[PDB]
Amino acid sequence: YCSDCGADASQVRGGYCTNCGASADRIR
C-alpha cells in the first residue's frame, strides 16, 4: 500500500504512486 494515501500497491507506475504522486519508496 502507499503510506501517504493508502492506495493499493498496484496503483504505482513510473516510479510514483499514480494517486497522490508519492515517490516509489513510500510504498510499503
| Entry resolution (Å) | 1.3
For 13, phi then psi, to 5°, come to: -150, 140
β-pairing verdict for 16-17 and 12-13: antiparallel
- Count of CB atoms situated within 10 Å of the CB of 2: 20
Output the nine-digit C-alpha cell for 12: 504505482
Alpha carbons 13 and 17: distance in angstroms, whole number: 7
Name the 3-class secondary structure at 19: coil
How far is C-alpha 4 from the geometric centre of its chain's CA atoms? 7
Q: H or E segment at 16?
A: strand 16-17
